Design a protein around this nucleic acid. Sequence first.
RNA 1: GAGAGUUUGAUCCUGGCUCAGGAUGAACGCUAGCGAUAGGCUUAACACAUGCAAGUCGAGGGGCAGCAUAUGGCGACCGGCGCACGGGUGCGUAACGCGUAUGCAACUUGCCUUACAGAGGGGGAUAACCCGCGGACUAAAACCGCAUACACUUGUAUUAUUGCAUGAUAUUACAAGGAAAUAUAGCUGUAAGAUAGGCAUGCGUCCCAUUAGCUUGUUGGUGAGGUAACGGCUCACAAGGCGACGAUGGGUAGGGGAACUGAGAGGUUUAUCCCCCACACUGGUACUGAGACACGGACCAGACUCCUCGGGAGGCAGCAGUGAGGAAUAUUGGUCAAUGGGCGAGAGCCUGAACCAGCCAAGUCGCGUGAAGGAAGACAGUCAAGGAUUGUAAACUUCUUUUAUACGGGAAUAACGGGCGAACGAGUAUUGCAUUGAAUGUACCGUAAGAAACAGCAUCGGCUAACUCUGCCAGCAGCCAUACGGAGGAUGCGAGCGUUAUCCGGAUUUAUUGGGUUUAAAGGGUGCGUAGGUUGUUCGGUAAGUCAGCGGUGAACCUGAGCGCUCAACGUUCAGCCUGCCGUUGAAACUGC
Lengths: 122, 77, 200, 118
Amino acid sequence: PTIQQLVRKGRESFADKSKSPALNSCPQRRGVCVRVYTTTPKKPNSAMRKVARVRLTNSKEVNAYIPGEGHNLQEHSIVLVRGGRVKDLPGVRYHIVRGTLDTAGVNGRTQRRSKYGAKRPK
Amino acid sequence: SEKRIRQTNARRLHNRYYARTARNAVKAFRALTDRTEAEKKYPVLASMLDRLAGKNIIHKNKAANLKSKLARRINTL
Amino acid sequence: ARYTGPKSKIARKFGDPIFGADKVLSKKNYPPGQHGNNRRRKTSEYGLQLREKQKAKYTYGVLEKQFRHLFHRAQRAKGVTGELLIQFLEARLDNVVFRLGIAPTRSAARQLVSHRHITVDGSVVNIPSYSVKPGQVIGVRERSKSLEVIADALTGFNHSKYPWMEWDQSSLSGKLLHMPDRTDIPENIKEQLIVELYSK
Amino acid sequence: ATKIRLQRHGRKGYAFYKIVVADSRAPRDGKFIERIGSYNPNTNPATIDLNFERALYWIGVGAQPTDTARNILSREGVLMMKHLLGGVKKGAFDQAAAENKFEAWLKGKKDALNNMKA
RNA sequence: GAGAGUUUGAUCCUGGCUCAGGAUGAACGCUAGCGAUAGGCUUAACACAUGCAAGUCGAGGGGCAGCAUAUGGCGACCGGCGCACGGGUGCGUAACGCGUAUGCAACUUGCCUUACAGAGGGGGAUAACCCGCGGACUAAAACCGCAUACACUUGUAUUAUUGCAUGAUAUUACAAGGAAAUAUAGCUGUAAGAUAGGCAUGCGUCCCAUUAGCUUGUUGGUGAGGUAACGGCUCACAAGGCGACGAUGGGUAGGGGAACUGAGAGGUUUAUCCCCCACACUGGUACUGAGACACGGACCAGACUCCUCGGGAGGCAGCAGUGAGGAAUAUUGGUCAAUGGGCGAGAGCCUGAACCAGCCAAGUCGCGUGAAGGAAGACAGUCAAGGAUUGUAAACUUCUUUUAUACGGGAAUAACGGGCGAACGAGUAUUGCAUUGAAUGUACCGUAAGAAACAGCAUCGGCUAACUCUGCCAGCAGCCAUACGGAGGAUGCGAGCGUUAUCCGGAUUUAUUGGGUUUAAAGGGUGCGUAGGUUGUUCGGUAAGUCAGCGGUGAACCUGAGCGCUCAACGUUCAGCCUGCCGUUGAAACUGC
Ligand SMILES: [K+]
Ligand SMILES: [K+]
Ligand SMILES: [K+]
Ligand SMILES: [Mg+2]
Ligand SMILES: [Mg+2]
Ligand SMILES: [Mg+2]
Ligand SMILES: [Mg+2]
Ligand SMILES: [Mg+2]
């Protein structure tokens, strides 16, 4: 544009959006599991992923992926939800923090223990 | 705590009495017509206003304003 | 913190016996682990820069945060960045003690400094990272001038040939003349690689 | 009223004071009209830096010093009536010569012998 | 001042996205030794119990319950000063509120300093005490007259000087009017100073035009009243004022310096720190006072809550408990020893300010978890031999740091009481005074003893093979095994290491510096034309833009040099930044007139 055009109007800047908006800028949130179900990945991936419908304290519905081998989650279980989205799964943009509140650590883990909330073996 | 309440109330009554007296005197003087009579009652009212300003019920500038206005009126009858 | 691990592993990994002279470096010139001496896979230029940085760090007993701060100091200072970095590394109190020969190894010098057997300008200084300036006097503490280890280390060190260090055996002390040039410093560290790695 | 006092400005365990001229209602380390010196009580000689002319001017216009500020001013020699003399002139107090009084008191040094003959 | 990947069978572009880097008052998972120095309800101006946070003066007065025979002192009462500060919070507010620069010939200012004058007489109440809620008595530096102030205020006149219009200042007055405190340090009037406020201005100060007209004390005048003060501030002719250079309305927000970030331009936020503003359960009204949004004041009206049948209380945005909410943030701690503050003649009293201690992976810095010798044990992995490995076990020195004992500073300098030059101020010499505190530091016992984990290892990327096998992993290319799980090794880092959240840079992805529009997104269907933007050549003025000189103004943090923390973070001093704003002098090439 011309200098006169920019004087008249100017430039416009647009703020970005959060990748995980249901956290409300909190690093984690507390929630209650509505339904703990199993889902299918996209076309090039075949598995049975474990997902949970979680009602956060700020009255928001989220789909949170439960990581690790096996879980003890059921309905009406208090869990901690953090950010992070799985690629093949569509609409699942949150993770359950293992080893906190109701959800326990992954049993039998020896490597990457801190990512799955597993205590150091004796 | 009641000491402050009592002192404030006593001082409020004390200030109100003298302030009302001065205001009534000013109002009565403002309605006079006889020049000689006005000149005879001007000094006492000036004394009252100046004593009030000294006692700090009113401000010295306020007393000066009132005295100036009343002297101007007494000049113009 | 300190490395306090095995030393022959690092010596064999880097080839050069940076921790002095050892009998293990012969008949074993491979990096540790079961995958050693299996040819030599092509390591990238970044890998070479990283290995040079690690060689300097293991040589002088400096951890990564302190090393980065030393690089920042060299960058702020006036002169060649790499030469200044090597001068700052050699100006540490434990390195100065080791060059004076009071202790056999740099780790021994650090242990003596930490355990307060070294005095700087007549006062006890026990910080191994203390930066020695030219004109200062570093000597054995008077209460520990008859230590068996110190006496053994000084036995046979009658040379004291370092040009930038003046040794006085009568006072059991030494002084630093000036900051030596990088070519005078006897270390095989290529400071240029560390400089580009830390600046890129 | 206007005052001469010290603001604590060092760190924990090491107090350093800034000698300022401030209104009495101001916060201790807050607003100040002017800065006239500094005070380090950690050193045994009790280090003092002061602007003599400005301190004398503030005393003249009537700033009231605190106890320690008054002691500092007396030590520096601001508190004098040499200017108050109405019957004399050029009355050189020369008390700075006696106020020098250099206290070069040191401590003897002793050493422990190392009898490690083994 | 530098990155990488990703659309294709392959290529060059355009374009978004995702990862690398730095930072946090962060949280979470695993793990955890110390010291120093920072920080600690980011969610609601949420709710509760207890305690403290502002008192002091017996050199003001009547007195004397707690002691010596009213005198030590002191409960209560009258009285003086203070509680408007220190401290807390960010609701409201788009405004002369804030920043920057000024003006007041339209202003006020307790305590403090200096100078000039003066402190003469008198009167009446009512607290407490006493007698019953009502009555009686009495004192003051409480309150109020009279006298004197011609330094003050008001009115008039004269003279002189002068400014920026209203005007200002200084001699001359005559006239009227206005004060005081005493006790063992003080009081009153006036002027100047200092300090602190107030008012008014130039410029700058967020989005929405899917907000275009707004305004009737509203714009100006005359007069009056009122105020510390000018003024529609208020009250009794004219029709004006503000508006696309954005009025009005709606939404959102306390504002700066800092801080962070980037080569810079710039961007983000005002957590801790400093300045200004606003507020104190919600509204309204004032009183007292030098000063009031009255933060530990009052009255009224609301709502909420508590304790009691007549009613009475509270406000947690002061400091500590607790509860709730939340991912999440600590002791119902010590001391007034230091600094500051209030009161007091002083000694002194008070101080949840402050200085400290306690708790908290805890932001940053520093240190340790041993040093030098020791051959290829046992057990784990791979293939008889590599590797873990000089690693272990042995033997010899050291004790930073833990443990036990002892010496133990500095932070504290004035005090008060004695003097000495003399007429009050200072100048000297002494006593006592440390929460932290067995904390710094120092020294001796005998001891390797008490002290390492976390994340990677197919490429980008630094690191490898065996055993398992949908379970999974995952930033991308993708992998169901150099990618999943375990084992052995190796690689980063290291008392930390990873994950998530948020912000900035590369990102030129709003491009003034510094992008584009034939076909990638992007020329209005085409003209005329209002506001606006731009303006051939030449001469002469002006000085708005522009250029130059001089002057004023602009804590902490940040940059070279030191100094002190054993080093370092940090603290502190000094040189180098002021590179904005304002005032005043010049220049005339260019733009404007
Ligand atoms: K007052
Ligand atoms: K105190
Ligand atoms: K032209
Ligand atoms: Mg009188
Ligand atoms: Mg008043
Ligand atoms: Mg560290
Ligand atoms: Mg197109
Ligand atoms: Mg066309």
